[PDB]
Design a binder for this molecule. Structure first.
Ligand SMILES: NC(=O)c1ccc[n+]([C@@H]2O[C@H](COP(=O)([O-])OP(=O)(O)OC[C@H]3O[C@@H](n4cnc5c(N)ncnc54)[C@H](OP(=O)(O)O)[C@@H]3O)[C@@H](O)[C@H]2O)c1
Length: 316
């Protein structure tokens, strides 16, 4: 297992990164500092997480401390849905760059294919629960993303939560200048994503797996929901290999040629989670973990199920 995967922009991306959704602003600076100290070189961020300033304090201190050089870090952020119009993309990117203390991103993703009405609220509502859409489509927002590459603000651009028809729409765009480098999607043993992974990889698009541990701290968790970290079949595979359940859940996507971005703010788990380059799951283990698919999603964007570009009606 090599540490980096080659992207279609010619750059290499670390296959293990640190997630930051739900990392409290008063804890995420130390989380990122610890992560860089123990070997992480990839941080996954987003404006909608409301903690980029604090992530940036950590990055900037480790660069100032010469723990790491900027060229060795791979920092990812995401354009939120209320910024899909052409005239707002650059300012959104630049706000994220300012917050993160950076003069470029390694990768900037369209966070969801659904555009929302611009304004202060991240989920604008009409009077009844519905999300108020934007009329700007995925292809004009993609052109605005391409402009960021050509202005030097981002090294690579990509997409997140796009279904295969939507990836295809991008790939078929008239006048396409840059293909997406990455599609970041939910992926774990309960949502194994064979069809969409197969499609993206066949096109040279790298897939990043989010919520690899099943997001036990997701806000809408219900007790009845399945739980990867407590699944006795996964605990048995981990015991066989003398690893933790989380380590198995992180190694699983790595062996599918995916990038994976487990989140923690706990120093011991941050270090734990990185110690996954030292064992291998068998093919039998991999097929066994794949067999647990339940099409179960952490992130179903439930307020947006009537949006024209809602991604999860489609089989994949
Ligand atoms: N593109 C998108 O739309 C999107 C959507 C969702 C997620 N993401 C990205 O993917 C990242 C990861 O997904 P996620 O945050 O949903 O969840 P996750 O990484 O599946 O799980 C995070 C949860 O697992 C706990 N945890 C971490 N390591 C552990 C270990 N070794 N043992 C036991 N528990 C452990 C964390 O607790 P502590 O933090 O308290 O240690 C936290 O409660 C996000 O943070 C974000 O960067 C992107």
């Amino acid at each position: 297992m090599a540490s980096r995967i080659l992207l279609n922009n010619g750059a290499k991306m670390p296959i293990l990164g640190l997630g930051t959704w739900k990392s409290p602003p008063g804890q995420v600076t130390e989380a990122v500092k610890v992560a860089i100290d123990v070997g992480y070189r990839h941080i996954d961020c987003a404006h909608v997480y409301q903690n980029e300033n604090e992530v940036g304090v950590a990055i900037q201190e480790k660069l100032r401390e010469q723990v790491v050089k900027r060229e060795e870090l791979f920092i990812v952020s995401k354009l939120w849905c209320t910024y899909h119009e052409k005239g707002l993309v650059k300012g959104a990117c630049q706000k994220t760059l300012s917050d993160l203390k950076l003069d470029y991103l390694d990768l900037y993703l369209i966070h969801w294919p659904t555009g929302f009405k611009p304004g202060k609220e991240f989920f604008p509502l009409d009077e009844s629960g519905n999300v108020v859409p934007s009329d700007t489509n995925i292809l004009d927002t993609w052109a605005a993303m391409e402009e960021l590459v050509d202005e030097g603000l981002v090294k690579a651009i990509g997409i997140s939560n796009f279904n295969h028809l939507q990836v295809e729409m991008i790939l078929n765009k008239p006048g396409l200048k840059y293909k997406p480098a990455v599609n970041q999607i939910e992926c774990h043993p309960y949502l194994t994503q064979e069809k969409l992974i197969q499609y993206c990889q066949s096109k040279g698009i790298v897939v990043t797996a989010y919520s690899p541990l099943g997001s036990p701290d997701r806000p809408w968790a219900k007790p009845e929901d399945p739980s990867l970290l407590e699944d006795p079949r996964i605990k048995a595979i981990a015991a066989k290999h003398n690893k933790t359940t989380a380590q198995v859940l992180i190694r699983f996507p790595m062996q599918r040629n995916l990038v994976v971005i487990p989140k923690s703010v706990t120093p011991e788990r941050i270090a734990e989670n990185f110690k996954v380059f030292d064992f291998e799951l068998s093919s039998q283990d991999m097929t066994t973990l794949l067999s647990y698919n339940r099409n179960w999603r952490v992130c179903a964007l439930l307020s947006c199920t009537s949006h024209k570009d809602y991604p999860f009606h489609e089989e994949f």
